[PDB]
């Protein structure tokens, strides 16, 4: 791959190339992306969306994404400095700066959880199951193998890609984020037939991939190098910060001057994240060659020298947090809530003339496929409050 | 038609004619009807029944019916005065007085909403749907076309007719209201094959129609002239008063000495209702001839000179009130509540020997048809509290 | 004043000067400040703290501070660019960059609401009143005029200064933010005898003021120039964004392609903020001379050409939002909650040996003054949930 192309400032619809050297410092494309996300309706909605984790402080999805983005900016900034020293022409010729790299990773990391449905992975599985063995099965014969697969294996990252680019009468291209940011956002650059985009966004990513110059591999491409840093920010934060929350929560049983547990835990978290950030940067530059070639077959943290302690932390979290009664009860309830909303929307879609279904449309509100993936997208992005409430009214409460 | 006969004081079961001139002033039949309604169990129950409309003052169904009856009494009183001047023999010979007309319309208007199920029109549609495509469908082949139609197109006005006349071991003829009052109550004098009576009350209305001398038109007859005034009271009140409530509620965004909004709105409502009452009276006398002939094909307000402002008010109410999220959520929940209660009652009716169904009967409690229309009648007249509670227990709460 | 000194990277306790040119790009002092705020316990707590403003999206204090910081970064970045063009030596000699200015204003703006008590200004007044006419009055004769004034006129900005610098056994200097950031944070550089710091932090600000070279004016100094940008970000956001929220909330009655109100409102908000940001930058550079001299006697927005529309927006917000029943009820309840917690803490402080007061200390937990200002600080920073709950238990619920 080529860095000059990987750092594209192209926005959907552009008819002409944007040159880094021409950019207005006060309106840097990559930095503008961060600000568009912050003020966006979907990001804002994260304020009212909790993680599956259940007093002390516990992150909602908005604060979790904020902290992940801060870790992301530091990772990008650091790699950026080293990348410009290794490839000095990027700066002296093309005008790129180390903070451009922090901006790209920060923005992509900030929006990473933006399209995930409530209830974490159980939420995704509930949606998938709805179309596999639930009411949604009825559409199987009216869809292609990939359109149907999109539904059966509904993935939050693909929905996030849709949320960030969705076209609307008064807003084509959605947030119209820089292509380098969309590339950094894509962890799995492939179709449903652990994938990064639905059929509804295939045309867009092809344009993004071509523009970035991603190595071609039923389409798929090599991962944009900066996506490795977006992934690391996630790995680091979900590992250490969720551990921090589990402790403050009590689920995980618990410098010498600090008298409060949360302060001791916070200091350890900061030190630990700092160590992993520094190491992740070195690992990236160490395998930068393979990453640019598309042969690197793992994550940055996979190569960590603290893989053992990292593994022990993830297992204890799975043990005390994800296997906790509170989380399991929430996920179970989540299946019923999502399954109910999806069925009510699909039945209204099928029989749109009945008084009841019209009410449902008034309450909760193209080809069959566009209508179905849109239903999945809207149900997935509903705030916790709206979803529970709409569910309760449908069930007669 | 003939007024002397249209003003019948006959009560169900009478073997002899009641003469107006013989009436005891302190026990005037039509006035007695009003008092029987007031003290009746079904009217009283309106105290605990809300409209679909969601702080300021908002009418429950009892207060709404009370105000409609006051408007009704004024309409009847005024038309009555003019009718006796046009047909002086009604008074000088038969002894009728202008207040008899106010009494008839007032009583009929007071009881007009008495049999409607909760959730307004959505409530009616939920009941209908239950027997059309829900569990109730199973009875289709055991009923006649009209008995089944009664269920599939369940109408609250027909149920009100049943509620007012239902026979019970210690109470035959129900409230035994004057026939002129029952005629004024009937907006649609026809069978299910926008109808005014179920098959279960067909025999009664035939007796009422014959006694009143209603023009014959699968039976149907010309509307009793005073029903036009009962209808106008409804039209006027649902139009202006619901608008008043929508404003005080905030759903509808908002003399010079009045400082409070509710007082300004109340004054306007009073002035507006007064204008429509006066105009409705003139319209009735203008078309009195056609109405007596049964050729008048519309409502009194249909002929209003303020039809435009009336139309704009109804549309804004539909827009800000009926299409409001609060109303839609309530109607949606209403479908589930009514559908659940009906199914539980029909399953218990079908399999009455199981322990569970016996409990259901103990909790919620003839030919198949009488049993089914009775189930619809009882579910429809349950107070809001009883319906929601019984529903919750059935659903395990 | 002198920019080279106003841009100090000094952190509390430093024994040696930090030079901009020596800074590690990946650890820029001003950028590090932003990250320390994000991950801090007091900033995180904003997640669970609502504004007094009461469905659509409505900002919690965390998201409000986040958006204010974004507006702040843009203001600083833009002024920064123009400042370096006017004073080229700052960059060519001292090594300052335009993003350093965005970093300083962004960080200061991000933390601006960090120490404010719940219930906005009513919250502040409730605390003040507690020591003026409530139980807290009893300490009047044991305190100096300024220590007591700190309490009677308790100000959230002063508490925020304390929160950001509070010393603790394992954490001296609190977040140890750069002095340029602390200066930008200070809107009112003076004592209680609309002030920016309590007696408990007087020693710290004197050090900050001396280091920055703030013009001396019972101490007080001229405002750090960048504080004008922090203030503008606040003015712009509280004006436009609160208006946006009031509309989406319904409290404020409500491009041509956008079909949803929130999208139309969001677009207008973005355009409006953009206009004010651009204008505020020009206003700053226009009066940069006076600001550097300490003679500028107003805010940047005070000089706006849209002062009228700005005034109309603020008045409508005061009218439909702050005077709304929901807000007034909350503020009223807020007085009782805060007054109760303060009294329980002061009584326990006075009579610390009783079983009850020991329980109170166990639940809710120096010179008299340090203990009292600490009680005000802790009560002020309690999340909404903890405050209400602790209040309920004290009242026997």
Coordinates of C-alpha atoms in Angstrom, one line a residue, chain A residues 354-356 359-360 362-363 385-386 389-390 392-397, chain B residues 121-122 125 323 325 328-333 335-337 388 391 397:
Chain A
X354 CA -54.2 -2.4 8.9
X355 CA -55.1 0.2 11.5
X356 CA -52.8 -1.5 14.1
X359 CA -50.1 2.8 14.5
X360 CA -47.0 0.8 14.8
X362 CA -46.5 6.0 13.4
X363 CA -44.9 4.9 16.7
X385 CA -35.2 4.3 27.2
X386 CA -37.1 4.4 23.8
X389 CA -40.8 2.0 26.5
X390 CA -41.9 1.2 22.9
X392 CA -43.8 -2.0 27.0
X393 CA -46.5 -0.3 25.1
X394 CA -46.6 -3.0 22.5
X395 CA -46.9 -5.6 25.3
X396 CA -49.9 -3.6 26.8
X397 CA -48.2 -1.8 29.7
Chain B
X121 CA -62.1 3.8 18.1
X122 CA -58.9 1.8 18.4
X125 CA -61.1 -2.0 16.0
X323 CA -51.5 11.6 16.3
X325 CA -47.1 9.9 20.8
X328 CA -50.7 6.2 19.9
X329 CA -48.8 4.4 22.7
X330 CA -52.1 4.1 24.6
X331 CA -54.0 2.8 21.6
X332 CA -51.3 0.3 20.9
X333 CA -51.3 -1.0 24.5
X335 CA -55.0 -3.6 21.5
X336 CA -52.9 -6.0 23.6
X337 CA -55.0 -5.5 26.7
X388 CA -55.5 -3.2 33.2
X391 CA -54.8 -8.1 32.2
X397 CA -47.7 -9.8 37.0

